[PDB]
Symmetry: C2
Subunit: 258 residues, 2 copies
């Protein structure tokens, strides 16, 4: 029953920037579902750290040093993967940065670097994997979007612009490459409880998040892996050009009032 197939068995998956964090969680989940998982990071130490962490979880991953804004390096990475592992079946554009600076104070170079990593690079990696997917008439591209794909906030103009950009990039890849049985979709994460934010739950910030979220809690990073597996599997083949928000209800809710 292809329609209820949530297995990724035998599929080759590349998740960018997945030496740790949400990418690592999504890639580990793909491995658990039978996928052959690949990732990149920016230096050998991070990739080494990534590889060992995967290996400690019983996952033989394939790790590459690669800057996702450098198209020659990206193409060579995809070329290798295709030869050593298999042509990429599943791409997750996960690698990303954030800056927090008032827009009117932000250096032009810094705004452009946010756009370059968070919007231009997803296009580059997508472009690199699409020939082989078109050829096989099968492929999944998942763009890690954001609540900032929909809503703005002070200090994050460049990130919001990038993420709003990525959303339309998802819809365009759907429109342009859908006819090849390629599905390009988005995940928009809510507020994820990462180790770094632990002191914000030790709390006024915690109260604000909990009040804002119908579910009344932060999300565990692993709560994104179910959505990620779904979009990467045959079960979601008719889902295309869609941003799947995983936010515990935030974007649906006007908020808890006093």
């Amino acid at each position: 029953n292809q329609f209820l197939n949530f297995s990724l068995e035998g599929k080759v998956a590349l998740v960018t920037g997945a030496s740790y964090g949400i990418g690592f969680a999504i890639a580990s989940a793909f491995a658990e579902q039978g996928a052959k998982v690949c990732f990149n990071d920016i230096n050998q130490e991070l990739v080494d750290k990534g590889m060992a962490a995967y290996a400690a979880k019983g996952i033989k991953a394939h790790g590459y040093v690669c800057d996702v804004t450098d198209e020659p390096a990206v193409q060579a990475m995809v070329a290798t993967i295709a030869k050593e592992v298999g042509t990429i079946d599943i791409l997750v554009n996960n690698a990303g940065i954030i800056r927090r600076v008032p827009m009117h104070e932000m250096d032009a170079a810094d705004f452009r670097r946010v756009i370059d990593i968070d919007l231009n690079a997803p296009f580059i990696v997508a472009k690199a994997v699409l020939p082989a997917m078109m050829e096989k008439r099968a492929g999944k591209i998942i763009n890690i979007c954001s609540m900032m794909s929909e809503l703005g906030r002070e200090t994050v103009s460049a990130y919001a612009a990038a993420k709003g950009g990525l959303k339309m990039l998802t819809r365009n890849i759907c429109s342009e490459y859908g006819e090849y049985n390629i599905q390009c979709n988005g995940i928009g994460p809510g507020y994820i409880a990462t180790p770094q934010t632990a002191p914000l739950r030790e709390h006024p910030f915690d109260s604000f998040i909990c009040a804002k979220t119908p579910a009344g809690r932060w999300l565990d990073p692993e709560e994104l892996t179910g959505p990620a597996v779904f979009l990467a599997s045959e079960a979601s083949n008719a889902v295309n050009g869609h941003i799947l928000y995983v936010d515990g209800g935030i974007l649906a809710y006007i908020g808890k009032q006093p």
Copy 2:
């Protein structure tokens, strides 16, 4: 008088980028009719001069400047010269832009990046440059010319959709961040505009536009000037972070079926 129904722009200094012709020129000319002091830029002296002459024939004294909106230092010099010659900018319309048409998988990274830079990065650069005085005055208007491609994708226009998707979210973010200063940032999303450039398409393409549009016709450029004046006026002070679609109904309609 009644500030709530004040659609006049008397005294306000307006910059409309790339407004030597087309939609920009139509908007800038409407601003002038409403009492605004109007400035525009283009990329070379030949365009500026022709622009100036077209304003002059319509009885409009404009200020035209040679400026590359991707060159931050030049934008700053232009904004500063405008401040000396005319007055600090009260209304900005981010209108200058380009479109490329190329399958995404075949598009050079340079060309993708260039589309993003002119259509997304430059609006940020110019907004950055005009915000200081608006903040000091506790009054300001920034209108971004978005697109139906801020919502919907199409083959060949991946870079343009991404840029316009980004510009939608940049509009929301500037509202979020600068609204407290009584500055309003909003968008105009035009539908199919009947320009000299699109003259050939008016015919099977005409029937496509006519089928998709509840209004059942192309839009005249001047039909954007009502909405533009509205957003630039005191009448709209409570409208903030909002994309005003002027599309004769397209985005609301699933389309005419056989």
